[PDB]
Design a protein around this motif. Structure first.
Motif, PDB file in Angstrom:
ATOM      1  N   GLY B 427      34.684 -20.147  -3.690  1.00 41.53           N
ATOM      2  CA  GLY B 427      33.809 -19.975  -2.618  1.00 41.53           C
ATOM      3  C   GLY B 427      33.280 -21.386  -2.208  1.00 41.53           C
ATOM      4  O   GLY B 427      33.280 -22.315  -2.906  1.00 41.53           O
ATOM      5  N   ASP B 428      32.970 -21.409  -0.823  1.00 39.13           N
ATOM      6  CA  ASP B 428      32.219 -22.544  -0.085  1.00 39.13           C
ATOM      7  C   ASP B 428      30.825 -23.032  -0.920  1.00 39.13           C
ATOM      8  O   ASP B 428      30.529 -24.273  -1.280  1.00 39.13           O
ATOM      9  N   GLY B 429      30.119 -21.944  -1.200  1.00 39.85           N
ATOM     10  CA  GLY B 429      28.884 -22.098  -2.038  1.00 39.85           C
ATOM     11  C   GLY B 429      29.008 -22.638  -3.633  1.00 39.85           C
ATOM     12  O   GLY B 429      28.362 -23.744  -4.001  1.00 39.85           O
ATOM     13  N   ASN B 454      36.040 -20.576   3.043  1.00 39.97           N
ATOM     14  CA  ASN B 454      35.010 -21.290   4.012  1.00 39.97           C
ATOM     15  C   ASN B 454      34.596 -20.068   4.839  1.00 39.97           C
ATOM     16  O   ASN B 454      35.178 -19.914   5.870  1.00 39.97           O
ATOM     17  N   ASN B 455      33.715 -19.263   4.545  1.00 38.36           N
ATOM     18  CA  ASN B 455      32.959 -18.380   5.312  1.00 38.36           C
ATOM     19  C   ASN B 455      31.347 -18.712   5.906  1.00 38.36           C
ATOM     20  O   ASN B 455      30.794 -17.905   6.578  1.00 38.36           O
ATOM     21  N   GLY B 456      30.960 -19.781   5.476  1.00 40.07           N
ATOM     22  CA  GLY B 456      29.514 -20.251   5.622  1.00 40.07           C
ATOM     23  C   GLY B 456      28.378 -19.897   5.230  1.00 40.07           C
ATOM     24  O   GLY B 456      27.171 -20.175   5.706  1.00 40.07           O
ATOM     25  N   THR B 457      28.314 -18.925   4.179  1.00 38.04           N
ATOM     26  CA  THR B 457      27.432 -18.052   3.480  1.00 38.04           C
ATOM     27  C   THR B 457      27.768 -17.896   1.938  1.00 38.04           C
ATOM     28  O   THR B 457      28.664 -17.957   1.554  1.00 38.04           O
ATOM     29  N   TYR B 458      26.338 -17.496   1.329  1.00 39.46           N
ATOM     30  CA  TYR B 458      26.273 -16.848   0.078  1.00 39.46           C
ATOM     31  C   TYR B 458      26.333 -15.436   0.346  1.00 39.46           C
ATOM     32  O   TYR B 458      25.634 -14.381   0.316  1.00 39.46           O
ATOM     33  N   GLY B 459      27.955 -14.849   0.380  1.00 37.92           N
ATOM     34  CA  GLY B 459      28.106 -13.726   0.809  1.00 37.92           C
ATOM     35  C   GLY B 459      27.879 -12.630   0.056  1.00 37.92           C
ATOM     36  O   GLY B 459      27.405 -11.142   0.419  1.00 37.92           O
ATOM     37  N   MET B 460      27.931 -12.531  -1.380  1.00 38.16           N
ATOM     38  CA  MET B 460      27.638 -11.453  -2.478  1.00 38.16           C
ATOM     39  C   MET B 460      26.200 -11.051  -2.443  1.00 38.16           C
ATOM     40  O   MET B 460      25.619 -10.062  -2.406  1.00 38.16           O
TER      41      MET B 460
HETATM   42 MG   LIG Z   1      30.611 -17.997   0.892  1.00 44.29          MG
END
Ligand SMILES: [Mg+2]
Ligand SMILES: Cc1ncc(C[n+]2csc(CCOP(=O)(O)OP(=O)(O)O)c2C)c(N)n1
Ligand SMILES: Cc1ncc(C[n+]2csc(CCOP(=O)(O)OP(=O)(O)O)c2C)c(N)n1
Ligand SMILES: Cc1ncc(C[n+]2csc(CCOP(=O)(O)OP(=O)(O)O)c2C)c(N)n1
Ligand SMILES: [Mg+2]
Ligand SMILES: [Mg+2]
Lengths: 526, 526, 526
Positions: B427-429, B454-460
């Motif tokens: 992940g990006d993070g 790369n999704n721009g966020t801390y998704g979980m």
């Molecule tokens: Mg992410």
């Protein structure tokens, strides 16, 4: 009925706290929800970078800083930075989240096992509470233990189900409590000390970092003018306690047993204020002191007084003792000592730069109230000789020798002093330990300047392998890193300097900029 | 007369050790000088990256790894990585240098204070020796304590003046010592267990990470075919212990108390091998087991057997117990269970990629003997459903949940298995915690593939704030990072993928390359 | 709804516990109230005497014992006795009471501060629970950690308000759990060991205390008869593992490095079972083994296997390994070794007694199934030569050398074996450390015999001052104590013996008595 969440944020605002430094997780969501509008949050991308930024902010403001991390993995990633905070006496309050009370015994995912033992032996105080209603009384003990002399770091661990429960209504007695340790020596014994200083025939003075922490710099100038005496800074110095171009100033002491006893030969009384006795480095065996010299030490730390191998000692507050001595001693009829000579200028062609040339150019162009930071290990003696520092709060260096301090700490100092320009000088090796801190400067628009000294090697380690006669050592060189590409990755503007005319142009641009800037400098390989 | 230096390198070569993982310092120069030509040194730029590379090498080779760090600051920077090593049972020997014996009491620069207490409570054994002649006997205790069941990490601290002194001539008795813990249950009690398995009417099996560590995978396939029984993997899985397209396989278990008792309802006997009972995550209160179900557990760790809240238990070696049960049970006359259905294909336009589409493309193009690593936290259930893994040693995930494991660990696995292609999905993070490890792959030419989601966020963390009903939480988004510029900074080739036809082209190029490669993928924001 | 009090006493009765050993306090009254009629309580007057009585009861019954003490002051008074329990591998469950949860933070009178750290580093496991509903799961972990190989002591601290609260109804799954560690070496590796024993030309055997703990004595007799080999006991012996008048028996080994390598010269294979390698005492430098000798060790403790300076090792259960080897080895055609000669009789006038005369008189008059205890430090070699011990469970001596064990331990052994007569032999110095234990024998009518050896001095310390050449040492003599008056103080019958005819009369009276008896003997001053 008020909750544990409501009662804890009221105790923090009444004790003067308004900023949180952090990286978040599952166990911390019930503390951070409903975040109040009179507080601000500062994010960083790794836990060594969170604690470094908070350490710079506390040292420059002279007040405590508040931190929030995730369980065992987050606490563990920060333990190198807590080693530097123990030796600088920095006041830091560290909190971390734990699993729900009903699932600790089965050891579910995210459980912190035997939690109070993890950061020992680096902290002053460490605890996990026995019930939800005890949490506000535990936060009160942590605030006061960090702030009392001698100052230092502390640790608290909290289960996530405690924040939504009912508080004890008698917790209101905590809100406005005040605790003082501002003390000095009794009148009869202080009188005996002043008489010994008034009758010395060739006195000398030595100063450490606890003088700059207390803002006692102007009282130490008055003491040296009355006694007419020379002044040194103690070895491996973390801060600057005196103006570096005053006529009494003699510079940085050598770090060996035999070298220090020869320097002090012929002085009858030596007074030390706010330092250990002494932080030695290389092996140099001999006499601790020569015949005819007596020593006297003033310190805020009982462990410093107990471990000294020579002299008498007094345990008290540095601000209250300096003010008392300065206003009681007589004016001597001896003549004031002579100022040190102007440093030599070294020869420079139109190619790769000598370190001596970089420091002379910064002293000609920067403002009179600038703040400097150092993590360029092979060039420290040249930096102390060539920069004129007139005011308090103007120098910081890693207090326990641990690399990864100066890059994140330079961002924390600039947020506490928005009217003074900050300038950090750093080696090619040291820059990689905490590289991701660059993102925090770009996101919050904080205008620090970063100067990188690129020689392709771990320079101080090659020098010491020479003196120990150690041949065929692996891992001493670091080729093939592009520092302008790393800055563009995290959103920071980048410039370069390969000769003297390019260095003058790049510094004038950086002084004008509204955001953060990095400059890559080509330097001479020893 | 032989020295302490000469005697210590002879003990290491006779016990099978030939590689050192490190970052150097002042206190380590007299250990590293005169480095012998039958050993190799591997450098990394930060201490979390040194310990991650060594952990990947030990897990894939099934043998111990050797590490060298600098004093308190270096040991402290690595304590997050030692949290992951405790829960995976990894055999790691950690050494660090101390100051000369004559300057420890005055606390000179670089002294490690109360040294054996610093890494507790994360290690099996921790010590600092009383004299130079004791150092070879202390290294013998460390090698054997790391290798005995249950396996784990250990710590040794050595003063720098010890290496040049004379050794004890009776140290030669240490060189060829052999220690065994390869044991199983007595004949009379093993007979009672086999009779209970032979008379069950609806049995089930559950498997954990200690099965893949022992190479017992083929013996567990024979056991399930004889009993005709369904097979699950235990929750928060660090390794893969069974072939994922065999007809008996049912996939990953849910992580809640009530969800697991409903899944097992109707099974009369349940056998667990090589797992804790159980690693729960979310809060889900109910019954531990329903009426009519009995449980039996086989484990290598006495603390696992003591803390289970239900069932009977046996403490022994996983390799010796699996071989014995597989060759003793009868062939049942029940019919073999039916294989799971083919996964659903989701709809995809010619823009940003769904995670389901990325996993189907990797299963069509990669070789049959590939090795995978995971640190993409919001997509774990889709990865286990869509990848066919036929062979042992094919999957790794952070064992204690701590971020900063997969990037450096993927470099260690590729150095132990040079004939199998390694592919890390991150992940990006997660990519920022250990970014400087990329330099080690470029300098030693190690050909790993890195895929960034790369999704721009801390998704979980946004998903879990929904289930706890937590509003107005700060610090959940990470905009403005360029991962192609960070790769060029450390010397690694970089590619990109914005649609399905660009993703197919980039993977075919990477499979052909002779050095390391990074690919940046644009994915759908939830 | 059941309470925490009701649920905890049901877990103890289902796991086989029916006796409590204790001294009471404020924090323990809510645990001890409403005491159930299927349990018995045993009181003693000081906490060193409580733990000594429980240690004797556990060693003789081969099962765990339960203890209850008061806060920090009571736990602290017992830490000398817990030092002996670590080295004998004794299974002891130690509980202590804490203040109410609402008054721990203010530190009220009777608070135990940082409680789990107080008995480290002497215990296997130590804990204080996070809530009242967790207390029954914490008692389950303590029972199983004390009973698994290698066996030892454990610690639990409980706040007094927890006992009256509601329990979790899912705690019923704990009541009937069973855990096994009864394991041995795999078939292929066991075959290699038996072949090496069958082809040796001059073998020898050495035995330790873990043989008597497991009841493996009769299996070790069968092994020595098949191999036709001599048998020794390892140095500083805490128990007796073999019949002392069998033809193969050679007695107690010397405690020096050079003395043990000369004794084993000429033996090609040496097998050690259930001992450390080795518990040395005096300084005696030389070779660990001579050329032509190889060593092999079987142990239940991984720390014993790691710290040996020579030989190969196997980690397993002593009962299961002894049974397997005894039934697999071949019958040798060598002749059985010759029995040791009858000891010499020393000359005796009609005054003060020689120690040799006291041991010959006990061997002529006592029953064939008697049990002996030793704390007479200068006479241990003469005791092993002159007493015929035919059966298991017949000898005990302080395992870590700590004085204050034998007087209270002799009362615990007599309560576990009411059909065998117990006889304790103790010095004038050793008798004072635990004198108040005499009251417990008189109150519960337990018929032990106590024999006191009065020479007026610390005899073993005068001998060792001779060998170290140490002159003018203070504090070595103890004149003016009347042991018949101390017995009348606590309610015990007292007799005396000043010559051989008085000694014969006093022992015949004591064998007939229905309560406890003490005899004071006048012995020769060296
Ligand atoms: Mg992410
Ligand atoms: C965490 C940590 N790791 C390692 C060291 C050891 N160390 C001391 S000086 C040095 C070299 C720094 O090189 P660079 O920043 O390029 O400066 P130069 O010596 O070239 O002037 C190192 C690695 C340390 N002090 N702290
Ligand atoms: C050292 C450490 N710090 C923080 C966390 C908490 N954490 C758990 S999941 C997560 C988010 C990861 O985001 P990313 O890699 O982008 O994956 P995504 O969730 O977007 O799929 C974080 C910060 C942790 N487990 N370890
Ligand atoms: C708690 C404790 N304190 C002190 C000692 C040291 N010690 C070893 S032998 C001994 C003398 C015992 O004298 P006594 O019981 O009269 O026997 P004798 O030597 O006269 O045969 C002492 C004090 C110890 N082992 N344990
Ligand atoms: Mg450099
Ligand atoms: Mg005596």
């Amino acid at each position: 009925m008020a909750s544990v969440h409501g009662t804890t944020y009221e105790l923090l605002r009444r004790q003067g706290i308004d900023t949180v430094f952090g990286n978040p997780g599952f166990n911390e969501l019930p503390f951070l929800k409903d975040f109040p509008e009179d507080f601000r949050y500062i994010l960083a991308l790794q836990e060594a970078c969170v604690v470094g930024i908070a350490d710079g902010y506390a040292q420059a403001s002279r007040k405590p800083a508040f931190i929030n991390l995730h369980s065992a993995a987050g606490t563990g990633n920060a333990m190198g930075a807590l080693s530097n905070a123990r030796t600088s006496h920095s006041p830091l309050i560290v909190t971390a989240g734990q699993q729900t009370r009903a699932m600790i015994g089965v050891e579910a995912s995210e459980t912190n096992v035997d939690a109070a033992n993890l950061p020992r032996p680096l902290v002053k105080w460490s605890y996990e509470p026995a019930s939800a209603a005890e949490v506000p009384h535990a936060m009160s003990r942590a605030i006061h233990m960090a702030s009392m002399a001698p100052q230092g770091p502390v640790y608290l661990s909290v289960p996530y189900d405690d924040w939504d429960k009912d508080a004890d209504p008698q917790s209101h007695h905590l809100f406005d409590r005040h605790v003082s340790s501002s003390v000095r020596l009794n009148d009869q014994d202080l009188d005996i000390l002043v008489k010994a200083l008034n009758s010395a025939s060739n006195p000398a003075i030595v100063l450490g970092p606890d003088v700059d922490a207390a803002n006692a710099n102007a009282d130490c100038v008055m003491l040296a003018e009355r006694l007419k005496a020379p002044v040194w800074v103690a070895p491996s110095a973390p801060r600057c306690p005196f103006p570096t171009r005053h006529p009494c100033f003699r510079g940085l002491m050598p770090a060996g047993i035999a070298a220090i006893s020869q320097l002090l030969e012929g002085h009858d009384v030596v007074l030390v204020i706010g330092a250990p006795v002494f932080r030695y480095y290389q092996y140099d065996p001999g006499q601790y002191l020569k015949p005819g010299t007596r020593l006297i030490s003033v310190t805020c730390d009982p462990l410093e007084a107990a471990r000294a191998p020579m002299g008498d000692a007094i345990v008290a507050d540095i601000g209250a003792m300096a003010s008392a001595l300065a206003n009681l001693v007589e004016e001597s009829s001896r003549q004031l000592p002579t100022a040190a000579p102007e440093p030599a200028k070294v020869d420079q062609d139109a190619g790769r730069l000598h370190p001596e040339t970089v420091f002379d150019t910064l002293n000609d162009m920067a403002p009179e109230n600038a703040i400097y930071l150092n993590e360029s290990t092979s060039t420290t003696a040249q930096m102390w000789q060539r920069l004129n520092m007139r005011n308090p709060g103007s120098y910081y260096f890693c207090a326990a020798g641990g690399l990864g301090f100066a890059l994140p700490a330079a961002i924390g100092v600039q947020l506490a002093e928005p009217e003074r320009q900050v300038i950090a000088v750093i080696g090619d090796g040291s820059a990689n330990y905490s590289i991701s801190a660059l993102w925090t400067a770009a996101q919050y628009n904080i205008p620090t300047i970063f100067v990188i000294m690129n020689n392709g090697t771990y320079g101080m380690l090659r020098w010491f392998a020479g003196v120990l006669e150690a041949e065929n050592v692996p891992g001493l060189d670091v080729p093939g890193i592009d520092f302008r590409a790393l800055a563009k990755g995290y959103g920071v503007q980048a410039l370069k300097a390969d000769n003297l005319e390019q260095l003058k142009g790049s510094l004038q641009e950086a002084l004008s900029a509204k955001g953060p800037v990095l400059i890559e400098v080509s330097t001479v390989s020893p």
